[PDB]
Design an enzyme around this catalytic site. Structure first.
Site, PDB file in Angstrom:
ATOM      1  N   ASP A  54       0.828  -1.200   0.000  1.00 12.33           N
ATOM      2  CA  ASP A  54       0.000   0.000   0.000  1.00 12.33           C
ATOM      3  C   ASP A  54       0.865   1.253   0.000  1.00 12.33           C
ATOM      4  O   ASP A  54       1.761   1.407   0.836  1.00 12.33           O
ATOM      5  CB  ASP A  54      -0.929  -0.007   1.215  1.00 12.33           C
ATOM      6  CG  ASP A  54      -1.835   1.207   1.262  1.00 12.33           C
ATOM      7  OD1 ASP A  54      -2.705   1.336   0.376  1.00 12.33           O
ATOM      8  OD2 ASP A  54      -1.679   2.028   2.189  1.00 12.33           O
ATOM      9  N   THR A  87      -2.941   6.292  -3.511  1.00 11.38           N
ATOM     10  CA  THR A  87      -1.665   6.962  -3.275  1.00 11.38           C
ATOM     11  C   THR A  87      -0.680   6.679  -4.404  1.00 11.38           C
ATOM     12  O   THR A  87      -0.003   7.590  -4.895  1.00 11.38           O
ATOM     13  CB  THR A  87      -1.083   6.525  -1.930  1.00 11.38           C
ATOM     14  OG1 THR A  87      -1.991   6.873  -0.878  1.00 11.38           O
ATOM     15  CG2 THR A  87       0.254   7.208  -1.681  1.00 11.38           C
ATOM     16  N   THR A  88      -0.592   5.418  -4.834  1.00 15.93           N
ATOM     17  CA  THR A  88       0.329   5.071  -5.912  1.00 15.93           C
ATOM     18  C   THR A  88      -0.143   5.612  -7.255  1.00 15.93           C
ATOM     19  O   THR A  88       0.681   5.871  -8.140  1.00 15.93           O
ATOM     20  CB  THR A  88       0.506   3.555  -5.989  1.00 15.93           C
ATOM     21  OG1 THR A  88      -0.768   2.934  -6.207  1.00 15.93           O
ATOM     22  CG2 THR A  88       1.110   3.022  -4.701  1.00 15.93           C
ATOM     23  N   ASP A 393      -8.779  -1.802   3.113  1.00 11.27           N
ATOM     24  CA  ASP A 393      -8.744  -1.376   1.719  1.00 11.27           C
ATOM     25  C   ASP A 393     -10.041  -1.720   1.001  1.00 11.27           C
ATOM     26  O   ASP A 393     -10.482  -0.969   0.124  1.00 11.27           O
ATOM     27  CB  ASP A 393      -7.553  -2.011   1.002  1.00 11.27           C
ATOM     28  CG  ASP A 393      -6.223  -1.457   1.474  1.00 11.27           C
ATOM     29  OD1 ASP A 393      -6.220  -0.388   2.119  1.00 11.27           O
ATOM     30  OD2 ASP A 393      -5.182  -2.089   1.199  1.00 11.27           O
TER      31      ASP A 393
END
Lengths: 528, 195, 519, 48, 190, 41
Positions: A54, A87-88, A393
């Protein structure tokens, strides 16, 4: 002060350094992007050991002196509360905008033009993505149940959950709906409690509609279950903001014992106050007493005779979630108790979990509450923390699916459709902004090429192939293959991404890319 | 300076070498000690008079301080193998180093995706476990006496348990719950109904 | 033993002034991107490891920790620029730095700093005299106290759905700030109450406070609706006889016992009814309903009472009458009373409303808007709010100039013409001060994306021909007239900027050799 | 399709160096003049 | 998609009643191998303590089935797996051809290293062992005492099957984490 | 991912010749057109 060891940057310098600073952190997370990425070993300073890919966890643990990459942490901190799973996606997309921004700087375009260039290009891509977007609730209701289960399965496929995912897929759907309203569509992460302990397996994890409190019911002789007591109203529990003890004045606080006479009297007075404070619980009809402070040995003696279990050392924040879920009130004093101010739940019982010596309590409710505690079990501490964040998630993906009934097909098909639409409209928009619109379409192509490299496919060959399938054949969504399948067209696989989730990513990526271009100077003071 | 406080990220070129050559160097410690004819290793401390010589693979790997962050992964793998059975820790580290040794050739002169290399092993290990099943033998021979030896062992397991009331009926249920499976003995093939 | 400078030598001569010029440029080049609303932001990392990003000129210069002693003057005048004025903190340092840069070739040629100071002080003296001619403050000349503020607020309100009715709507925006003390101007006192139904142009402005009719009970059309000098009283809770909420459980076994608690509550209120009678309050306003017991008693005494008034309206009631809030009804005291000039009940909107009108003691007004729907009125309330906030700062400072390089270039143009009539070294010195004023429009165009090379020549060509009010458009790049677009800036900012920047620049140059101890 | 398709895009961008340099060596604005050519050549053909 | 799935079936579904509750008894499941132990107690204490003690008794009986079951050792099983992996390396897609073949190389390195510490020639023994099992004679293995190849069934050299499954499973789990690594995050010292 | 490493670098030697070739084009770049800048040799 602090003249020495002071770093100063200028326009002709920092503009090139700000791009190189973003490419360093970007290339780090490109390897962990996607289900085929890398799970990294991370140890928090508090002692928690876990392994996850994550980006919100990885980037939060990154401590570095580059001021441009610090803005990536500031945006991810605000995005972690909104989504947390993008985020990625945003950092790579923001770095793709910065890589195209550096090319426009070499062409003589000011950085403030690039900020307004990506702003108008982002708003144009939203309208094009909405026209090709599809809706769930207005289409099929039974697939809405299947979409929520298989969307969590995508996030749970890279973890050991993949075996038992069938149970956690339903637990992630019910936990989000309980804390929200269908019309309001507001889900708070503080309303869903994520907890877990060592022992058992993941198949034994239960979904609780109420608080946990991690209590053994104090003295062991006290009953481990609380009955409704012949058709009463719910199960009444007492909430006290004052500790259990004989009351003392604030003016003196001193107690003088002259001899055994006053010693025996004061010992009985303290026991008489214990009998007066327990009667207020009996008059109100509260089965269990919940207090913020511990109890004495004589306290558990009188509570055991009347079959009144005790609860000790409850935090101030936990007292708020009890009155909300059980529809109770906060009673400041002891004598202000009453049946209307007591929290009413469905039942109270102590359920032993495996061989764990904790032996916590479970307070549920039949009606929908505002507080849900998700409890996860596992044979190892690392397995519990892995399944906990994997379930969290899934809570974030379902959160955006119920927030917007319209969803877009992911797997790289979303970025290609947004790129082909802006690139076609870029030639129709003349002026200096024409290159800003063309560079925005080329920046959107970085996402499917990054996923193609991590999937073992040609990033240029696959991207050019998907553009031909969506143009010469017909307009549809066909993305790169993240997980092993027989062929293309993820639309056949029913792989969907939330429209409000994907729109939130491109807005934060553009908002940060503009802010980075709005800083041409870096002032870092030394250490005195 | 990313990370900090002794935490750091290895370079993509050095990380592949630390995960391969760095892991082989750890496997090289137990490489020559594999087997009953294997060699021995020396463990020396700062005092130098406290040293010792042993061939145990679990003792050599745990005693030697490992500064390689990829070497700590093999320590966790050794703990997983020790939980299963207390023997074979040396053979796992050596076999894992041989898989990583060829993995260097599976990248440089190959250009094969690393996840496909794992999927290549998942299909190869599945055929490897199937080959061990076809060639599997047993000391279970004279099963007629072995089938009788199981009902007596089941009676010994019923001691101190409330099921000791009738040993003959309950041991027959447990014995027939295993041999009649002709397959995996896991509890997922046995349903319990409490009435 | 004791050393004041800690053994730190310092060079003297003409090189010390050069070190002071380079210090002003280093501070200027940092603040150049921060000039303008679209300008770039500076990231500063303090030794405390606290990273902050802001465009405020005062916040940046305080976190830089400038060791240079003469550069601290630019920070000191910036803190006074944000205090006495609040606007132009970044521009005053850039102007002082650019004026310092224009004086750099004067030192290489051998010109002493005395004539350099007197050349700039004379240019500022001629600039302030020109600004007063450029600054337009009009009251009785072809305008009034309203139309002057109504024109500037109409353009910002133009291109809206209310643009056709904008003539009547702009008059109520200026009358909102004029109905209250002009010394204290707040944008939270203009709060608008919406009236559903009716035409949009039929809205009426109210000097006092208004509220709806909360009376569902019979007995209306009794109390007189017109008062001369009514005494207004403010209340909170526990007024009427029967409590609407938070009751009590009282069990009585007899009928006389039930009539005892009713007469007991009657006597407690009856003593409170005469408390207002002895106080002499003709107006009773509270956030809780008023029963029939108080209405019948106040009817014979000609005392008006209205309950269930919203908390947003009650906040404007206190400041309108000049009184104070009272917690209970037993503590009612006469000093909380106030009076307006008129009281009446209006039928506007097909709903009867009780309101105050024409109160000279009112520190806040209330605007009543009408429309076919409440959502349309809500858009008008937001449209009128933006127009009031613009004229709010325009009413505080009524001396304004045309922004966007208009005034900046006119001062530079006249000083170049004044230099032709001034013989001596001051001729080239004034021309440098006029050239130093070119950095203000430059950095504004560079940070906004415009080309400072083209806009400087296009402005000077249009400004020097025909009309002298031509400015620079901030949105679309082109030459234009900011006086027609009603883009204004207060003159006291530019007057205090030319006074602070030129003085601080003339001070730094006034020393040939500076010896500064360290420690 | 494939690797060649991306080369056609880079080959087109490489042909713009000649008109961009002509605008730079003549004192005209680099980015401004090049965009004026793409704007006028859409409606007209080889006329500008 | 319709008519694409893995379906089950059973001959007869019969509903019975035991303990005053309706139960369902299936009959004739397809290739069904399993059993259901119905425990009838007099209380909850007899039911809970029996199920926990029954699984302990079934675990001891299952331990003798999985353990004491061995395979041919002495390089045999390591080479026998190589022949099956080479068979998997025969029919394979394009990119995994070298990945599957590399797994068979490490399987042949296990008897190679065992012959290293014995003091003999591993390249001679392992090469002849591969060619011997490739065509017939699947029971042959390496003899470390005489330094030759002999039948493992005649010499009586066997190794546990559970040990073989544990090493192969642990090697796949260890390679699963390490091969995905494009970078290494150093652990925080405790 | 993991791709062909190319231990020997003949392409990096060619990339050095490309940069050396682009440096010649940068010098001729200023001479393009009738208004181009002169070069002193």
């Amino acid at each position: 002060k602090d003249q020495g060891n002071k770093k100063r940057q200028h326009g002709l310098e920092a503009k090139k350094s700000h791009i190189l600073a973003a490419r360093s952190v970007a290339s780090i997370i490109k390897t962990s992007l996607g289900p085929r990425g890398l799970d990294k070993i991370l140890i928090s300073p508090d002692g928690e050991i876990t392994i996850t890919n994550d980006g919100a966890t990885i980037l939060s643990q990154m401590e570095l002196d580059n001021e441009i990459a610090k803005l990536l942490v500031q945006l991810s901190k605000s995005q972690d509360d909104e989504i947390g799973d993008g985020t990625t996606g945003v950092v790579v997309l923001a770095s793709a905008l910065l890589d195209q921004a550096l090319e426009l700087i070499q062409k003589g375009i000011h950085p403030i033009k690039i900020a307004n260039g990506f702003d108008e290009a982002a708003k144009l891509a939203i309208s094009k993505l909405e026209e090709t977007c599809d809706d769930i609730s207005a289409s099929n209701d039974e697939l809405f149940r299947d979409f929520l289960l298989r969307a969590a399965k995508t996030s749970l496929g890279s973890k050991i959950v993949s075996k038992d995912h069938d149970r956690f897929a339903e637990m992630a759907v019910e936990a989000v709906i309980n804390v929200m309203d269908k019309d309001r569509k507001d889900v708070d992460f503080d309303l869903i409690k994520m907890q877990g302990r060592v022992g058992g397996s993941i198949s034994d994890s239960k979904l609780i509609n109420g608080v946990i409190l991690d209590k053994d019911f104090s003295h062991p002789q006290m009953p481990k279950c609380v009955l409704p007591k012949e058709g009463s109203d719910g199960v009444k529990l007492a909430i006290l903001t004052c500790p259990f003890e004989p009351p003392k004045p604030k003016t003196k606080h001193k107690l003088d014992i002259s001899s055994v006479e006053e010693y025996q009297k004061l010992q009985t007075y303290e026991q008489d106050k214990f009998k007066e404070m327990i009667d207020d619980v009996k008059k109100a009809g509260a089965d269990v007493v919940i207090c913020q402070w511990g109890f004495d040995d004589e306290a558990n003696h009188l509570l055991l005779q009347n079959d009144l279990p005790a609860v000790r050392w409850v935090g101030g924040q936990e007292l708020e979630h009890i009155a909300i879920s059980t529809n109770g009130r906060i009673v400041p004093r002891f004598q202000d108790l009453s049946k209307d101010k007591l929290g009413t739940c469905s039942r109270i019982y102590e359920q032993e979990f495996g061989t764990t010596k904790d032996r916590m309590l479970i307070i549920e409710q039949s009606k929908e509450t505002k507080t849900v505690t998700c409890f996860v079990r596992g044979s190892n501490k690392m397995i519990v923390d892995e399944a906990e964040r994997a379930l969290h998630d899934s809570l974030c993906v379902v959160r955006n699916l119920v927030k917007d009934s319209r969803v877009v097909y992911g797997g790289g098909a979303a970025e290609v459709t947004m790129s082909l639409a802006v690139s076609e409209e870029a030639d129709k928009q003349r002026g200096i902004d024409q290159y800003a619109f063309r560079g925005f379409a080329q920046a959107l192509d970085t996402i499917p090429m990054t996923l193609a490299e991590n999937s073992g496919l040609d990033p240029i060959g696959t991207l050019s192939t998907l553009k031909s399938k969506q143009l010469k054949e017909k307009i549809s969504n066909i993305g790169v293959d993240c997980l092993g399948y027989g062929s293309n067209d993820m639309k056949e696989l029913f792989v969907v991404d939330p429209f409000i989730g994907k729109k939130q990513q491109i807005l934060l990526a553009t908002q940060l890319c503009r802010m980075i271009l709005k800083i041409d100077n870096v002032i870092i003071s030394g250490k005195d | 300076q990313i990370f900090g406080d002794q935490v750091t990220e290895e370079r993509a070129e050095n990380a592949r070498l630390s995960a391969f050559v760095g892991a082989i160097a750890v496997g090289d410690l137990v490489k020559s000690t594999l087997g009953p004819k294997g060699m021995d290793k020396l463990l020396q401390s700062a005092s130098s008079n406290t040293c010792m010589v042993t061939n145990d693979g679990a003792t050599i790997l745990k005693s030697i301080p490992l500064d390689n962050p990829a070497a700590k992964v093999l320590v966790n793998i050794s703990k997983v193998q020790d939980d299963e059975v207390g023997d074979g820790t040396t053979s796992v580290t050596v076999l894992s180093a041989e898989l990583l040794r060829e993995a260097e050739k599976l990248i440089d002169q190959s250009k094969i995706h690393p996840q496909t290399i794992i999927e290549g092993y998942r299909l190869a290990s599945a055929a490897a476990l199937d080959a061990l099943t076809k060639a599997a033998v047993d000391n279970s021979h004279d099963k007629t006496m072995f089938r009788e030896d199981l009902i007596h062992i089941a009676k010994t397991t019923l001691s101190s348990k409330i099921l000791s009331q009738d040993k003959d009926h309950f041991a027959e249920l447990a014995t027939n719950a295993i041999l009649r499976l002709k397959g995996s003995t896991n509890l997922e093939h046995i349903q319990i109904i409490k009435i | 033993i004791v050393v004041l400078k800690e053994g730190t030598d310092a060079s003297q001569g003409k090189g010390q002034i050069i070190s002071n010029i380079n210090a002003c440029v280093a501070v200027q080049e940092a603040l150049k991107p921060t000039l303008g609303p679209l300008g770039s932001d500076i990231l500063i990392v303090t030794s405390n490891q606290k990273t902050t990003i802001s465009n405020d000129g005062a916040t940046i210069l305080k976190l830089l920790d400038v060791v240079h002693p003469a550069a601290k003057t630019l920070v000191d005048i910036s803190r006074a620029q944000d205090a006495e004025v609040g606007d132009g903190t970044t521009s005053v340092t850039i102007l002082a730095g650019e004026l310092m840069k224009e004086a750099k070739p004067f030192l290489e040629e051998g010109i002493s700093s005395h004539l350099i100071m007197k050349g700039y002080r004379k240019a500022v003296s001629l600039a302030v005299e020109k600004i007063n001619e450029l600054a337009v403050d009009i009251t009785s000349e072809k305008s009034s106290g309203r139309e002057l503020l109504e024109r500037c607020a109409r353009t910002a309100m133009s291109s809206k759905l209310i643009h056709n009715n904008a003539d009547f709507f702009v008059k109520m925006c200026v009358d909102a700030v004029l109905s209250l003390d002009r010394n204290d101007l707040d944008d939270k006192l203009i709060g608008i109450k919406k009236i559903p139904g009716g035409a949009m142009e039929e809205s009426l402005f109210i000097n006092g406070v208004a509220f709806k009719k909360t009376f569902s009970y019979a007995g209306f059309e009794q109390q007189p609706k017109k008062f001369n000098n009514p005494k207004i009283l403010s209340l909170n809770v526990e007024l009427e006889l029967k409590a609407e909420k938070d009751n009590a459980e009282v069990r009585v076994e007899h009928v006389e016992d039930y009539q005892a608690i009713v007469d007991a509550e009657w006597q407690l209120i009856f003593e409170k009814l005469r408390q207002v009678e002895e106080t002499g309050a003709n107006i009773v306003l509270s956030k809780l309903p008023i029963g029939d017991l108080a209405t019948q008693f106040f009817a014979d005494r000609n005392i008006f009472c209205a309950g269930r008034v919203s908390a947003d309206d009650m906040n404007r009631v206190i400041q309108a009458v000049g009184g104070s809030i009272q917690s209970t009804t037993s503590d009612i005291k006469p000093e909380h009373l106030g009076t307006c000039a008129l009281f009446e009940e209006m039928q506007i909107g097909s709903e009867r409303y009780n309101l105050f009108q024409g109160c000279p003691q009112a520190k806040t007004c209330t605007l009543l808007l009408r429309g076919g729907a409440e959502q349309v009125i809500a858009e008008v309330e937001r449209s009128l709010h933006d127009a009031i906030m613009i004229v709010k700062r325009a009413l505080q400072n009524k001396l304004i100039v045309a922004g966007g390089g208009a005034t900046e270039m006119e001062v530079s143009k006249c000083l170049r013409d004044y230099s032709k009539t001034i013989a001596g070294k001051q001729q080239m010195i004034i021309n440098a001060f006029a050239k130093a004023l070119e950095v203000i429009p430059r950095q504004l165009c560079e940070n906004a994306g415009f080309d400072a090379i083209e806009i400087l020549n296009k402005l000077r060509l249009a400004h020097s021909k025909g009309e002298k009010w031509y400015g620079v458009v901030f949105e679309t790049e082109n030459i234009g007239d900011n006086f027609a677009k009603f883009v204004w800036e207060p003159a006291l900012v530019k007057i205090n900027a030319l006074n602070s920047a030129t003085e601080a620049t003339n001070l730094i140059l006034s020393v040939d050799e500076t010896i500064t101890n360290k420690g | 399709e494939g690797v060649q398709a991306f080369i056609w895009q880079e080959f087109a961008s490489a042909l713009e160096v000649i008109p961009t340099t002509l605008a730079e060596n003549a004192g005209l604005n680099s980015i401004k003049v090049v965009t004026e050519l793409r704007s006028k050549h859409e409606n007209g053909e080889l006329n500008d | 998609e319709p008519s694409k799935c893995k379906l089950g079936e059973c001959d007869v579904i019969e509903e019975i009643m035991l303990g005053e509750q309706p139960f369902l008894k299936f009959s004739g499941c397809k290739a069904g191998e399993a059993c259901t132990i119905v425990l009838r107690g007099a209380t909850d204490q007899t039911l809970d303590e029996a199920e926990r003690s029954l699984h302990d008794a079934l675990s001891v009986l299952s331990q003798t089935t999985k353990e004491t079951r061995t395979v041919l050792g002495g390089g045999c099983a390591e080479m026998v797996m190589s022949k099956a992996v080479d068979t998997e390396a025969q029919n394979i897609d394009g990119k995994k051809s070298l990945a599957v073949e590399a797994f068979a190389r490490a399987l042949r390195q296990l008897p190679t290293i065992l012959a290293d510490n014995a003091g003999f020639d591993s390249s001679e023994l392992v090469s002849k062992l591969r060619s011997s099992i490739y065509n017939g004679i699947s029971t042959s293995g390496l003899d470390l005492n005489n330094g030759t190849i002999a039948d493992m069934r005649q010499l009586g050299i066997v190794e546990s099957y559970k040990l073989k499954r544990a090493v192969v499973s642990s090697a796949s789990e260890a390679a699963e984490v390490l091969l995905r690594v494009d970078n290494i995050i150093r652990a925080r010292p405790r | 991912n993991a791709t062909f490493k190319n231990k020997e670098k003949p392409q990096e030697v060619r990339k050095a010749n490309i940069i050396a070739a682009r440096s010649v084009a940068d010098a001729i770049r200023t001479s393009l057109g009738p208004k181009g800048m002169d070069k002193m040799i």
